[PDB]
């Protein structure tokens, strides 16, 4: 199924996922597609940061839902 | 132009914006030491009078105090995963990197807004509900470094 991700840089991308995909599987797909390393990613939906072990279905994230990506920034 | 910023609330207390501008057109950049404390140096530069290369110790103290009240509830702490005690030991460590985690906690502890401009600007991340004119503005570059920003007088 298709979902959307709005990156930190403001870019809206499409991603092909399954309901049973874990958040980590989804981070990895963002890496494959945009080069953003999974350990910097904070995925947000419905004002909630999503947790690595859980799945899209747990958060009732249905097809065509839009996640927001914010990055952990350090230096 | 600075009034035109479009901030999207993503999660409690945190906003993102994607304006397009030259940092130098609107800000003076106050470079901070290339040690591991640049984040705290930057905060100190913008918050503390008669600031020195040692002033950052105080920001780190406020960060400790902030974590004790906010760390367990901080969404970004989940990427740390550490308990409150192990995180503190590491945070307080010599030359340790600050980050958006500390920024979020400090914003609440100091009662300020902190804006982090990650670079030409790629995006801004705002911690706090204030606007850029009242905010503590930081410049994040190289994915490894923070400097302080001050709005140029003509735009103040």
From Swiss-Prot, chain A:
- Stated role: Exists either covalently attached to another protein, or free (unanchored). When covalently bound, it is conjugated to target proteins via an isopeptide bond either as a monomer (monoubiquitin), a polymer linked via different Lys residues of the ubiquitin (polyubiquitin chains) or a linear polymer linked via the initiator Met of the ubiquitin (linear polyubiquitin chains).
Locate the transmembrane regions by residue number.
none
Outcome of altering residue 65 to D? Phosphomimetic mutant that binds and activates PRKN
What highest taxon heads this organism's lineage?
Eukaryota
Q: How is it modified after translation?
A: Phosphorylated at Ser-65 by PINK1 during mitophagy. Phosphorylated ubiquitin specifically binds and activates parkin (PRKN), triggering mitophagy. Phosphorylation does not affect E1-mediated E2 charging of ubiquitin but affects discharging of E2 enzymes to form polyubiquitin chains. It also affects deubiquitination by deubiquitinase enzymes such as USP30.
- Residues annotated as site: Essential for function: 68
> What is the annotated localization of this protein?
Cytoplasm; Nucleus
Modification type Phosphoserine: residues = 65
Cross-linked sites for Glycyl lysine isopeptide (Lys-Gly) (interchain with G-Cter in ubiquitin)? 6, 11, 27, 29, 33, 48, 63
Protein name according to UniProt: Ubiquitin
Identify the residues that the record assigns to the Ubiquitin-like domain, covering every copy. 1-75
Curated annotation (Swiss-Prot), chain B:
Q: What is the effect of changing residue 147 to A?
A: 40-fold loss of proteolytic activity
User: What fragment of the full-length protein is this?
Assistant: 3 to 162 of 3945
- Residues forming the catalytic site: 38 (for ubiquitin thioesterase activity), 145 (for ubiquitin thioesterase activity), 147 (for ubiquitin thioesterase activity)
Q: What is this protein called?
A: RNA-directed RNA polymerase L
Q: Region entry Essential for the vOTU enzymatic activity: which residue ranges?
A: 1-26
Q: What is the effect of changing residue 8 to E?
A: Increase of 50% in debubiquitination activity
Classify the source by domain of life: Viruses
Role played: Displays RNA-directed RNA polymerase, deubiquitinating and deISGylase activities. RNA-dependent RNA polymerase is responsible for replication and transcription of the viral RNA genome. During transcription, synthesizes subgenomic RNAs and assures their capping by a cap-snatching mechanism, which involves the endonuclease activity cleaving the host capped pre-mRNAs. These short capped RNAs are then used as primers for viral transcription.
**Name of the coding gene:** L
Q: What is known of its domains?
A: The viral OTU domain (vOTU) and its N-terminal extension is responsible for ubiquitin and ISG15 binding and for the deubiquitination and deISGylation activities.
Q: What's the source species' lineage?
A: Viruses, Riboviria, Orthornavirae, Negarnaviricota, Polyploviricotina
